[PDB]
Every structure is written in C-alpha cells, then in structure tokens.
Amino acid sequence: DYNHWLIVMEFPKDPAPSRDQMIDTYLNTLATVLGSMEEAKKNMYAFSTTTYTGFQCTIDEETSEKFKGLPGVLWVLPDSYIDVKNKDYGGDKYINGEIIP
Amino acid sequence: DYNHWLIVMEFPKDPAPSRDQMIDTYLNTLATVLGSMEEAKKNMYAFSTTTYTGFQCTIDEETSEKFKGLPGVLWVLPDSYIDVKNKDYGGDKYINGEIIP
Ligand SMILES: [Ca+2]
Ligand SMILES: [Ca+2]
Ligand SMILES: [Ca+2]
Ligand SMILES: [Ca+2]
C-alpha cells in the first residue's frame, strides 16, 4: 500500500503566481485535507515550484482521494522515490516549516 | 525480473497538441529509446492523454535513462500499479497497436 503521495498542481500561467504563493497553495491544500495549517507544515516533506509544481506528503490512500477535485489539483501520484537511494523527482526539501537550500 | 516504467511527459499548452499527436509522441519517444517503432508498438501497454500525460513500457534501467535526453520527458518512474490488483493510474490500455476503449 502507498502511504506517501505526490500531489501535482496547476497554476495560472499568466500572470504566474510567485514561488511563495505556490508554496502557500500547497500548504493550504494539504491543510484542507489534514485539518490544520500546522499539521500541513509538519507533514509535507518536499515540493517544487520550478522542475514541477507540486508537493509530497504522507496520507493513507483513502485520504489521498480528498485531493482530487480540490482547486488547482491536477494529478495524485504515489511517491516512489521518498525511499529510493539516488532517485528523486528533482524537488526541494521542506522540514517542519523551513525550505531547505 | 522485469522493469516496468511510467514515463511522464509534458506538452505545450498554446497551442495544445491533439490526442493523436500525443499518442504518436509516446510511440516515437519509446521507438527512439528502443531503436524500432515495431518494438515500441508491441512494448507500450498503457498511456493517458486526459487523466495524466505519459505512457507505460518495459525496458531495463540502463535503457530507461535514454528517455531523459528526449524532449518532453519529465519523469522516468517505476510502474507502481502494473502488478497490483484493483489499482491503476487510470490510463487507457494499448495492445500491439490497439487503443483499448
Ligand atoms: Ca515534518
Ligand atoms: Ca530518494
Ligand atoms: Ca524530490
Ligand atoms: Ca493504468
């Protein structure tokens, strides 16, 4: 069973929202599913606004369905790479509220 | 045993390509990696144009790296669902030239 999900989102191409605004959308999208913005910030562990626009998070399969239909949500994929050495989606890391360089 | 891949692709949005053109691109992209359109058509077993944008296929890991040099290839992911009952990506099936309705 898949416990970790890649949520791919879409943003208006013009004018394009800023990196910060995209990340805020991710967190608000997770917060909607999880219950709270604080849960979201402690859950999400990776994301992108460049190589792709989406984020990675941990929910059970049934809950991952709640992402479909939410504004901006495009595609809900299982995270194959969270635990594979030397493979990733080309994303950035996010740890408990802080973007990692 | 065998390695099964979801190849995720991206297409321009203005103008957008047609379904037929995307499917052709999947087969072209696979054919380039394989070195044969004939092999590509026997190999590819599923794809999407709606629910997602990409296709599934069976090659070894080394050969699958050839996709990453090709235009439109975003991710080269392991197929998560090919051997899992009652779970799939929602893609359409493709069988030796037949798009399966
Ligand atoms: Ca955390
Ligand atoms: Ca990894
Ligand atoms: Ca990543
Ligand atoms: Ca499928």
Q: Is the peptide bond before A17 cis (omega within 30 degrees of 0)?
A: no
Q: Return residues with CB closer than 5 A to ligand 1 (ion).
A: A 42, 96
Q: Per the structure, how many domains does chain B have?
A: 1
- Give chain A positions within 8 Å (CB) of B13: 13
How many Å lie between the alpha carbon of A66 and the closest alpha carbon of chain B? Answer: 16
Elucidation method: X-ray
CB distance A6 to A46 below 8 Å = no
CA dist B100 → B84, B94, B95 (Å): 20, 6, 7
A2 contacts B80? CB cut-off 8 A:
yes
Flag whether residue B52 sits within 8 Å of chain A, measured between CB atoms: yes
Residue B51 is classified by DSSP as: S
Of the candidates A40, A44, A56, A50, the residue with the CA atom closest to the CA atom of residue A88: A56
> Is the minimum CB–CB distance between A50 and chain B shorter than 8 Å?
no
* Residue ranges making up the domain that contains B75: 4-100
The per-residue DSSP string of A19-85 comes to: HHHHHHHHHHHHHHHHS-HHHHHHH--EEESSS-SEEEEE--HHHHHTTTTSTTEEEEEE-SSTTST
Cα(A46) to centroid of ligand 1, in Å? Answer: 10
Report helix, strand or coil for B12. Answer: coil
Q: Name residue, tokens 């080309």.
A: A90
Query: CATH number of the domain that A92 lies in?
Result: 3.30.70
Q: How far apart are CA A10 and CA A12, in angstroms?
A: 7
